[PDB]
Design a protein around this ligand. Structure first.
Ligand SMILES: CC(=O)c1cc(-c2cc(C(=O)NC3CC3)ccc2C)c2ncccn12
Length: 126
């Protein structure tokens, strides 16, 4: 089996900004989720070869992971916070699409998503 190339984390012709909302997404949101006991399945792209999930990238056509999001934030890849929030939501949604309800990995995603929602509830204005 083969994995696909990972999502891009740098693109010199993509316009970039560093806003206070994006700084919050790195310093508060990403850092809170990254240190969590349940973060580890989400800290890198799914290696469907090593995990013996040959159908993963047949089902998941918009992969996303926190390793990618971390690199994007540290590279100032984004223009606005909504782009980054969409990446997080894609990662959670992919987990719920691929896995069975009640699987341990789904419980892990739900726990991270609850914290995610609590932090973005206080996303600073501007
Ligand atoms: C997000 C998702 O659905 C998901 C993630 C994992 C997962 C991936 C890795 C991994 O790829 N590590 C790379 C370094 C080699 C490791 C451990 C786990 C539990 C998983 N395993 C079974 C079903 C679903 N998943």
């Amino acid at each position: 089996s083969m994995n696909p190339p990972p999502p891009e984390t740098s693109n010199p012709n993509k316009p970039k900004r560093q806003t206070n909302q994006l700084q919050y997404l790195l310093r508060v949101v990403l850092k809170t989720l990254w240190k969590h006991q349940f973060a580890w399945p989400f800290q890198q792209p799914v290696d469907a070869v090593k995990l013996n999930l040959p159908d993963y990238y047949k089902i998941i056509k918009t992969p996303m992971d926190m390793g990618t999001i971390k690199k994007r934030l540290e590279n100032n890849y984004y223009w606005n916070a909504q782009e980054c929030i969409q990446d997080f939501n894609t990662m959670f949604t992919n987990c719920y699409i691929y896995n069975k309800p009640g699987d341990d990995i789904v419980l892990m995603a739900e726990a991270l998503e609850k914290l995610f929602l609590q932090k973005i509830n206080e996303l600073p204005t501007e």
